[PDB]
Design a protein around this ligand. Structure first.
Ligand SMILES: [Zn+2]
Ligand SMILES: [Zn+2]
Lengths: 58, 58
DNA sequence: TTGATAAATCAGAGATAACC
DNA sequence: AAGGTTATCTCTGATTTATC
């Protein structure tokens, strides 16, 4: 479905297409992989860890 | 969108269709209307409020 | 093998509102 | 014009199948 949104890109990896918009502790629009990755390890997602796109499942 | 969900109906009004399945304190699924009504009033939505259909907005 | 991550996907809680 | 009922919108946390 729709991964975009009017005037928004991640406040970490700067993506404009995410299956779901999350939000960091400073209230800033981060994407899925950034919101998840942070919640888990507790350190920002590494830009080296930035792929090309998004996938599907089931 | 999807208004039904296999194996589920509202524990409070028995409807099988809703805009968003919620949960009561007992852990049972309840429809959007019943869940919101209880949160606002602290009493179960009465059967007298049950309506034939679901409306759409803007 | 197994175990730890990846991220989509699924939930649903709370917010915001439309509509009579 | 004001409000209650509850559709929708946002967003946080669990579930899941793959991938390392
Ligand atoms: Zn990002
Ligand atoms: Zn109900």
């Amino acid at each position: 479905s729709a991964a975009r949104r009017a005037g928004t890109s991640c406040a970490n990896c700067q993506t404009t297409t995410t299956t779901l918009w999350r939000r960091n502790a400073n209230g800033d629009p981060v994407c899925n992989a950034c919101g998840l990755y942070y919640k888990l390890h507790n350190i920002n997602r590494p830009l080296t860890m930035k792929k090309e796109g998004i996938q599907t499942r089931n």
